[PDB]
A paper describes a structure:
determined the three-dimensional structures of these four agarases. initiated by GH86 or GH16B, which generates NAOS. depolymerized by GH86, and systematically saccharified by the exo-acting GH117B and GH2C enzymes. exo-acting β-d-galactosidases, while GH117A and GH117B are α-1,3-L-neoagarooligosaccharide hydrolases.
of the GAL residues in the −1 subsite. with the GAL residue in the −1 subsite was identical. classic CH–π interaction with the GAL residue in this subsite. pocket, at the base of which is a serine residue (S326). residue (T82) in the place of the phenylalanine residue (F77).
Residue numbers in the entry: 21 to 646
Write the structure that this text describes.
Amino acid sequence: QTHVQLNLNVKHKLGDVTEFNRPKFINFHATINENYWDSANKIADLRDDLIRKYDVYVGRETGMIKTVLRNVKEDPERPGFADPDDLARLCSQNKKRYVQNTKVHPYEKYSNLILCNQFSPFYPDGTKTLKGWALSQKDTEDEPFGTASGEFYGRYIKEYFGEGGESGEPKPGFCEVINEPLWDIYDKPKAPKSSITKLFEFHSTIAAQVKKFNPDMKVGGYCTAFPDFELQNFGRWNARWKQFIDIAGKDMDFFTIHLYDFPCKDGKQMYRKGSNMEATMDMIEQYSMIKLGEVKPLMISQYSAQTHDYNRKPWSPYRDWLRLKSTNSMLMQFMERTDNICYAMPFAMLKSEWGYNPKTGLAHTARMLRRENEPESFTGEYVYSELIKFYQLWKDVKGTRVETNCDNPDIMCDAYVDGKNVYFIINNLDFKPVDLNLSVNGTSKDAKSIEVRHLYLKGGKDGVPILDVYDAKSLDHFTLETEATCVICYNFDRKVKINETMEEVKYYATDYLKEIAAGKELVFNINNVKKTEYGEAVIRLGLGRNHGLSLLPELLVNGKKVDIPDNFRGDVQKDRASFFGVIEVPVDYSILKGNNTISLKFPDNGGHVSTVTMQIFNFSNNIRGI
Ligand SMILES: OC[C@H]1O[C@@H](O[C@H]2[C@H]3OC[C@@H]2O[C@@H](O[C@H]2[C@@H](O)[C@@H](CO)O[C@@H](O[C@H]4[C@H]5OC[C@@H]4O[C@@H](O[C@@H]4[C@@H](O)[C@H](O)O[C@H](CO)[C@@H]4O)[C@H]5O)[C@@H]2O)[C@H]3O)[C@H](O)[C@@H](O)[C@H]1O
Ligand SMILES: [Ca+2]
Ligand SMILES: [Ca+2]
């Protein structure tokens, strides 16, 4: 059995973050004003049900800005620029419509918009708009590449947005430059394979133009489709994210990526959830520290699963389950880095009727709503898809984060205390059920009631997701299903007393990305580590190696041997072309100092140590009783 401990009197602080952030995490890729809320739905007031009743936030939108770009007239004085007057006119028309849409104004408190451009025709590669002109492709001293695209974006923001309600739509919280650009530039079928660094330069130019018109706006990039750093023996890292940080990092307010699991790509299962995404995120942070001297806030503006083998099929509950299980696991991992994550948005749209293709009968593959007669036909009124089960599972969850421990790296856990209520969340990265033994420490009182919520798959492949919700008299043991999540809600007679603190601090090494040779010591240094009397620690070894090569180096920390566990977070990456993941290594706190030397020695040749970082967990008192 796996032992899962909730220390509900011990605050878990990370930076200045001590609380669950519902807007940052419990959200979807929608806006309050899309017209799809207001027709063809079984529920008459769907905003009240989804946004208000479930307390769900928004959002992200790229379609309105695309429509304006594709239809705006060209400046007669400046070939390749949007006409400022016509741009102001189109934006004013849209503003007037927002101003008159008074029914949506009370929902602005649920909205913090991520604005982004779709790749085309915003990227100035010669693609013409519906008006027959292309954004300027110049790259001169006075007109650096992207000047016209940037001016369009800055003017759009200035002209369309107001300050809420009858003054116009609130300004976006975040402006991403461009969606998944290297997919179109380099990786898609028949891509032109034009310059990669030119796209990075373009980001600095866009940021400068947006800020010329809108001085306080936050700009970010590069909104990566598939951040796959280990490919070509880390040549992909070196050509892409490394260069983006070197070229544009200083000009970005935030970094942004997309993270998708591949549960079914020609029958293969290639996951990011677990150790792989830990390696991706650690590498961005570590190289940002080396080059920029600071970790940049990270946005994940689309995440969950891409379901290739089901993307030419009609809707099913099973396809929704594939998305659900990736969402829950990735969310837990983003919650662990809440101090350096500014926004994480599951890729689920409200309705996306525009994505229905009548030639094939295929609807959009990531919808909160589906028509009642799907999958047989795209007819009938809209009802919730199975993706609503995510928001049902996470309903009410809020409060001050408290310490949890689960002695199986395939089991992730977290917990939040909201007055009398405690939410204990447990997620399974393993591909079988896991029996859990639960301990709740730090109070002398038993809970008044326990509500168990368990989201799992019934019936195997092509089965259905089930959200079981029930009251329990006690919960000392619980079997968490394959890739499942539970949210256990404890209700107490009186407010829970939080009287200790565990402060987590993450430390980076002085260097990174070292080639592995057999028998050759690799030395990393992690310095200025602050210790207290009582604490715990985890060393984080990012390894990128071909299959068959050892993931069990000899590890010395300050000259002392430290064992590496056989088990790490998530799957062994069998169907991936190589292993890329962080191996988390508990380390005796007494071995650590302020300046630390971490030595690795492998028995075999090949691959890299991508990063070595360390989490320190410092206690306010002897909370373990050692
Ligand atoms: O499209 C017009 C429409 O856009 C709407 O806004 C879009 C904008 O923000 C939300 C909407 O979707 C986003 O784009 C994503 C979306 O189109 C999904 C599909 O639902 O696709 C995602 O990209 C996919 C596609 O291209 C890159 C990525 O993967 C690709 O698949 C590949 C496989 O085919 C292959 O076998 O394997 C490789 C890996 O090796 C890939 O997996 C492909 O599926 C998009 O990110 C944003 O564009 C707007 O709201 C509307 O008004 C209207 O403008
Ligand atoms: Ca990309
Ligand atoms: Ca990449």
